[model samples]
Target chain A: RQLTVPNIPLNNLANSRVPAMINKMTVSTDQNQVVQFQNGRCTLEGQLLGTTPVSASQVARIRGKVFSTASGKGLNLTELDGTPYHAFESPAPLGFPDIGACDWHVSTFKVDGDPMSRLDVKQNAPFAPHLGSIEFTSDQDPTGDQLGTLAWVSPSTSGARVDPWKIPSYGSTHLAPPIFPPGFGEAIVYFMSDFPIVSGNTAQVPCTLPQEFVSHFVEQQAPVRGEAALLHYVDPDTHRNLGEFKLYPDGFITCVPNTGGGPQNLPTNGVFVFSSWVSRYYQLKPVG
Target chain B: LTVPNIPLNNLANSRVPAMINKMTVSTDQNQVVQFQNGRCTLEGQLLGTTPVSASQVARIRGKVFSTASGKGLNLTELDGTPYHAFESPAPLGFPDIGACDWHVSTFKVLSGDPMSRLDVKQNAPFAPHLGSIEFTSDQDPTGDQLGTLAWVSPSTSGARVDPWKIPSYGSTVTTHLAPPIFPPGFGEAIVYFMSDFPIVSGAQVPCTLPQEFVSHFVEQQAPVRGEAALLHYVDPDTHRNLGEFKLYPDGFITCVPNTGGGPQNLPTNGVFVFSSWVSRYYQLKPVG
Candidate 1:
């Protein structure tokens, strides 16, 4: 059976602005619009500032987002003086290769506003070759179970309307291209579905197989039931689908026994089971 | 009265006006069957809560006193003292007659024993009398209350027999005598009566003269102008029995009634009264 893969955009790569490695967060308290560093700790100042009076001791927090040498690091805005200034140091240096290479892209489409869709994309990443990119379109007047047409592109593209290539099975293998430096490696790629695979019976679900399985992914988001929606795996050059294993009530995915199976393959497109929050970005190499 | 180890059958010739057929002595709290009437005919009390019967007394003689040296024949006057010869008499009648008076000389009795010391004249020789004096009788006499002639020092000395082996204080009065002349160091004292004292008649006899007649040999209608007299004897403690009076040939055993219904100094009965007093003494609240 075919796997269901998510459609992530390529231009959505985030440009990490702060350096990785051990970065100290600076917590600043704003007194009548003047910002002052209360201590060398970061706070959830953004959420706190949303409240009235701004009497909080902390008003702003700053920290590194990822471990990329090309794109520097990411910075998050927080509430003022919420909890104690808390900023975790990144384990590696960030921001390298491209300025916004770690950015996430969001793409949406609507048939007639009956259904709408969105896709996550990263800079300098290949399109999902097997499942391609997810496309959600609603026909307020007429339509069946098939929602609408979806599109995908590789490397870099502007507004191309190329139809999505429906691959038969998700190729199971490591897909991430090795990093340029001899000792360094590229950032792991995480693939996920925007929509869940709803099934009334067990026969329609995909089978489990090792050759089709992509390993080493991080969980970017946890699920409500079984496993986390976030996963970890090397990114592939071609777009792919993670068919039947996609949507679960817990926002998680796993391998289930297929009706016609004795070792069926899994998806090449793996999900990074890390976080859904925008502040964090993936790293291509281990940083000191 | 002839009180034998076995029952005696010659009450008529024995010259004993009354012989004791049964007598009881008990240390148990319950009414112990110390003496019974089935074995012999007379009925009497001997330091008991119940009237001792002839059979029970015989049983007592066989069981408790069979091995005694004084032939298990202890005959005390109403006074607590053991008998001395010629002061408190031995029983010589078949069914022991009158509470026989005994002739117990101070010489025949020990000096140290409380039962032998006669609180009578300083140097009066003991002589046999018609009846026994009374000590702590059924009468709940208070302290210092004039006792009967039997309780006088002379009477007590005359009745005391084997003083060495008297039971501990508060022991029942009906304990029998030990063997005589066995150790030889202290010969057992014996008592005798004239044999003419009335028998079978529980009568009171006035045998005591006024206190003046005793210490001063002077009698008066009242105490001589503030000089202490019998009436002047105020009881020191409240719950004790005073000695009885004897009229030689006839008299009554005067008993001091219990101040409380059951026993002297015991509180009057009633739930409300007892509860109120208890609460007041303990400082307890009346209402919840």
Candidate 2:
């Protein structure tokens, strides 16, 4: 079965992909693993969307449509003809339970397996995983506010429970997606998730830019009992000292007022807003 | 995959979106502006391919989708879902889309002149090496398998490995998964590949790390914006546990000794050290 989408223009990158089917086959996994197809290794077969200078891209199929492999180059997948990909799941309930996790280990594994379990999982690149235990809530542009996306950036553990934050609420207004004007920067907000934020003084959490910008994340623990678990921010440095952006609970990001009482210290690289919290995971929002 | 820092063609400046193909680097100063693909490492960390959640894999050039006047369909999995938080594996699925909220985020923790230009050169030649290894399986001539196998770090001298014998099920009832083998200690250890180490050319060129990375200098209270360490090398068939490469404000790197002594050998195909607080900001992908 083939699927089609709205006739929107495609970028050179997307257009470079060809219509290929997953090969799902067998191999005598060699002593080093990921053996070739014995004079016939499994490979994709298809044609480009058109011709625009061909380049290679990883393959993935969803909704029966072809997209790049979810994890891109870190993995290669296999499956029997007409079968679903191997799917991983959340340890909790709701939000998105039946999604697949890509394998990060082994040269190659089966179509239905988690990313072959990489080394230092939870050890190296601790935050490499998705923002977990995410709960979604919504609010309309109550303050002419929209397009606010902030992120919690920590080099340590951040999480929570028993909080209003974990529960999803629309709160009366239907915050619909905006018909953004074309020709704007690619820094538009395209996704939003409501997760809990810890309360009280969360240290080492540099939710702000340039402050908590650490380079490595060794590990991340889940929400502990008292990590606050809220969904907002109140910057101690907003007044002068070149303030940054402030995060709103209503799924938006806004500029922080400077000591001059005008918007100040907003990032030139306003592609994303970040904040660290006492919570296990910080809410990450992409902004313009 | 290490290239030298002499003269690379069509190389993008640090501010421009470019792929690390194998890997690339040069002193943020001017020591040996070179490019590498897991070739050399004064020190670094690995960004295992597995993701924490459902996120779209941006193309090799790291460009988000660009359409011609709404001629394409939008991507729905950019927020890094399914494998949310990288805690476990799960199936791929959609997110609660306010698709407008999921645009391509391209935040460079860099200030003005992040990385404009540098001379490119061809890198050295190297071959694969082996590391300490051991294998384990639990099933004993029966249905299910359980147990632990041991594998240690590789040395310039050789590798140490335990063993596991794969007993065929003899029937199709159960397909035997590859035996499990844990990796060496993750944190604080230099990364070494098991096989297929990249071999770079010898031409010098200008290159930089992906913007997703932020660097931590040894003593700065905060990460230096618009900067990355110029450290990456690839050799043909050799590995080592050279102590460390110390950096100076002037951009030159000096070698230091390890706790043990100095230049020790590590047998393996490749080694990746994307280290220290190179702080990864966020991933970029297309939106549906």
Candidate 3:
């Protein structure tokens, strides 16, 4: 008679970036037709994307995909072929309650006398560990103007809770991949955090200014607290001084063109703009 | 009857930019003119207004003037009496024939020495004996040396050296110095000579552009040969690219401001300008 083992669920299996391979085998059988199972082993095949498990003690939290297979007297345990296994060992967590999302799914199969601990049903869903806390807010506008807003959310959000300055906004304006004026060429936009944007003085905007655009306008809205920041414009080609703008702690942009021109609007197309706030700025090319 | 020797013509005298000592002496006919002269004992007691005689063998060539002294019996017998003397040896000349005016003047004095010997051991001004030789020309309107020209005496007739067109004739124009416009705060000019103004392509203008004026206009003028030469403007602050101008060999200038504008005139005051063709640009200050 063939004995079929039910699929066993593994906790925290989704934590691995790659899929885990599970194999089933029978080592011995008792006279009562009871089969003795060997210690089952699972190996992950690719780079581990997220944080590794804190220690062997925390292995119980790794939930794997459900695994099912046939195991009994008729099945030959020696027939199971073996190959070199590759996987990142998860490191112990630093006591932070929050952690990054898991990458792989894991599951286990067993017999009645199996020594492996049973799966905890409460930890079945994907793990959403909290590593740290981050808050976003805006300072009051000195001119009584409304302060702008920004957001931080998980990647799983589907087209909801998108902020006005988020990457998605680039598409809404129909200027996803910014189009700069002629001679502007290509340049990179950097988003930095932790660094304070000092108030009062003007700084050079770290971006390439196109030839046609004589001046650039920088609009900055303080997110949380009344601390001023600086905005600057630089010519990457010649590294010449284009000028700078100052953002007051009250959340207002002050224009200062080297050529003494009035404030101008941000480019609607062909140019790339980056924000150095809440969520890190990343390049997301817009579709035509 | 008193006989006066033709004023002893001195060679290289005009070449000395500074004043030297001068003295005159006369001897009586008594004691058979027991004057004693030695080449090794000769000293320049007085500065001569003209070039020294080329014939080193003819040390004393003075015609005696009538003299009536209280002790008229052989004044030449007083050989032990000291006679004052002062003079500078022939000024050294630079090796290159077209080195510059100073070098030319030096060479003329040295060549005039009939004995082919120089009494002074000091080197000439602007012409070191051992270092590398420098060439200079004119930079037109900028008053910098970046071109070569042949001039008639008294600032009258002049012509280009390398088939380049000549500047508008000004009967009183003493010299053609390139004039450059500098940014505010700096006030100086430079003069160079003998360097052939190059046409076509771009070359760095040898001048000490002030840190503040590096971003100003770069105006260029080509020779009559019709080969275009480019003028590049750089930012002194950051060494950034400001813009460039193209000058047709026909002497017409086409300005290409980084900001897009017509050709601009060089500043006449409060800035530095250099010549392109001379050995190197030397600064000149305007008189009040």
- Which candidate ranks first by lDDT, i.e. highest? 2
Evaluated on chain B only, candidate 2 has a TM-score of 0.19
Error of 1 at B149 (Å): 99
- List residue ranges in candidate 3 displaced over 4 A: A1-229, A232-288, B1-197, B200-212, B216-288
RMSD of 2: 26.1
Ranking by lDDT: 2, 1, 3
Higher-scoring candidate on lDDT, 1 or 2: 2
**Per-model TM against the reference:** 0.11, 0.22, 0.13
DockQ scores of the candidates: 0.00, 0.01, 0.00
For residues B206-285, what per-residue lDDT tens digits would candidate 2 score against the true structure?
Answer: 22222122112211123343233323322323543322322222222222223342212321122223233222222111
Position B232, candidate 3: lDDT: 39
Where does model 1 exceed 4 Å of error? A1-76, A79-102, A105-256, A259-288, B1-288
Interface RMSD of 2: 20.3
Question: B91-116, model 1: which lDDT tens digit per residue?
Answer: 11112111222211111110111111
Model 3 lDDT tens row, A42-137: 111111112222111111222122222242111111100011112222121111111122111111122111112212111112222121111111
The C-alpha stretches of model 2 lying farther than 4 A from their native spots are A1-288, B1-243, B252-288
Q: lDDT score, residue B162, model 1?
A: 21
